């Protein structure tokens, strides 16, 4: 009867086209502002002093870029970790010079993605679902907050944060290799196993369902039209695909349970990306990966090279060349 | 010893944020009755509007 | 300096295959409206 109850009834209605919910009250204003500023800053945005040395790095399309090289540049080294909104900038020209829109996009992104995650919970509550799709979405939220939030914190500047682009991503990955040795760190190892394993069990499960489909169509029409939507009959012989994989490797390595099978597809990647995103986090605070340089010596004591020493000389090439003007002192403490 | 404390209590403090997500998803749904799954006799989606 | 044959590569790489996929959808809906026999078959 009241105005608030007629508003709570609408905002929590599943009869809307897109469910809004109470998290959409701060998902939609956040992500539309992260979007509408991203499209403008990617297309039309002046160059940005990223190294704090007043050498402005172009990143937008109107200043001679493309899809690959164009990128929303991170904020300045001069700012660093300080909060830099528009009203604390004394003009928009001073805001866009010092890496303004990187903080406006990222902070409205991480609020909107952490609200998109809670929105996946909310609709599962109002639909009668068991709730935990949003726990599986915690794994890219852990990884998005690792390279945009946690790594600028432990390194003390948003300038070490990830550039919102495509070539800026590979500037981020290579400089992160030289300074932290991520490939030898066992948490990037535990998530390469998460996505190689994840793409394995995806294409391994998706093939054994498509292999054991039941005849419901003719050879002229499509294979997919043998599934009517909302039917109650099972659309594939699960005993058939169990007997196949029960002979392809051996018998006891096969899940006859389809529920425990469809749980292992959700376990393996998500655990692999939780562990990986806490690799960037523990390497944000300079707890680097393994270092086996000069580890094998002869009885005389001369250093015998290994593959890690060849990997070290690739890291030394990126270390002596990243931010080639920003350094003045012999050790990259930042 | 700073890098051991900032990388281990930080390490745990994300997984306990995941513990807030697991244990409250179950507890809010155990209070409502559907933590064991959807009822076959009464599905809530079928008693809704057309989908659009 | 960019290659001026790339405009012809991209804008025909967009339009010619994308206008192809539109045609397979329009004749799909015409056959469904063709059999249905009401107000649109003719």
């Amino acid at each position: 009867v009241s105005l608030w109850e007629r508003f709570c009834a609408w905002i929590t209605s599943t009869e809307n086209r897109l469910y809004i919910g109470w998290f959409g009250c701060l998902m939609f204003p956040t992500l539309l502002t992260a979007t509408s500023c991203f499209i403008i800053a990617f297309i039309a945005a002046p160059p940005v002093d990223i190294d704090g040395i007043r050498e402005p790095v172009a990143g937008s399309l109107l200043y001679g870029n493309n899809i690959i090289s164009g990128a929303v540049v991170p904020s300045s080294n001069a700012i660093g970790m300080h909060f830099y909104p528009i009203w604390e900038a004394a003009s928009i020209d001073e805001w866009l010079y010092n890496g303004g829109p990187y903080q406006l996009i990222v902070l409205h992104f991480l609020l909107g993605v952490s609200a998109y995650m809670g929105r996946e919970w909310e609709l599962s509550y109002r639909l009668g679902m068991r709730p935990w799709i949003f726990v599986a979405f915690s794994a890219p939220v852990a990884a998005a907050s690792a390279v945009f939030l946690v790594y600028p914190i432990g390194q003390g500047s948003f300038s070490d944060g990830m550039p919102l682009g495509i070539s800026g991503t590979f500037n981020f990955m290579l400089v992160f290799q030289a300074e932290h040795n991520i490939l030898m760190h066992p948490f990037h190892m535990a998530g390469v196993a998460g996505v190689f394993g994840g793409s394995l069990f995806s294409a391994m499960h998706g093939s054994l369902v498509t292999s054991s489909l039941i005849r419901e169509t003719t050879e002229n029409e499509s294979t997919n039209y043998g599934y009517k939507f909302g039917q109650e009959e099972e659309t594939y012989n699960i005993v058939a695909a169990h007997g196949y994989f029960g002979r392809l490797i051996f018998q006891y390595a096969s899940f006859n349970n389809s529920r425990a099978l469809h749980f292992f597809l959700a376990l393996w990647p998500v655990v692999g990306i939780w562990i990986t995103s806490m690799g960037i986090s523990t390497m944000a605070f300079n707890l680097n990966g393994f270092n086996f340089n000069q580890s094998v010596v002869d009885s005389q004591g001369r250093v015998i090279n290994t593959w890690a020493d060849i990997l070290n000389r690739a890291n030394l090439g990126i270390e002596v060349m990243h931010e080639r003007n920003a350094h003045n002192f012999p050790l990259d403490l930042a | 010893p700073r890098s051991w404390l900032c990388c281990s209590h930080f390490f745990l403090a994300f997984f306990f944020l995941v513990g807030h997500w697991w244990h409250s998803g179950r507890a809010r749904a155990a209070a409502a009755g559907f933590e064991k799954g959807i009822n076959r006799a009464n599905e809530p989606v079928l008693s809704m509007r057309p989908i659009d | 300096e960019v290659q001026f044959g790339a405009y012809l590569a991209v804008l025909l790489g967009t339009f010619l295959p994308a206008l192809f996929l539109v045609n397979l959808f329009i004749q799909t809906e015409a056959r469904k409206a063709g059999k249905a026999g009401g107000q649109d078959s003719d």
């Binding site: 086209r17 499209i39 297309i43 399309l61 109107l62 001679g64 870029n65 493309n66 899809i67 939507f229 909302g230 | 057309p50 989908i51 659009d52 | 960019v2 405009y7 991209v10 804008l11 967009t14």
Partner: peptide, 30 residues
């Protein structure tokens, strides 16, 4: 002149995302 093509590809991609969400073929039981 060159960046005009890149912008048209980007907003043209966001058009077909808009039509796929709102003008989707709504699936129906029976």
């Amino acid at each position: 002149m060159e960046a005009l093509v890149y912008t048209f590809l980007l907003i043209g991609t966001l058009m077909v995302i808009f039509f796929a969400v709102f003008f989707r073929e709504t699936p129906r039981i029976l």
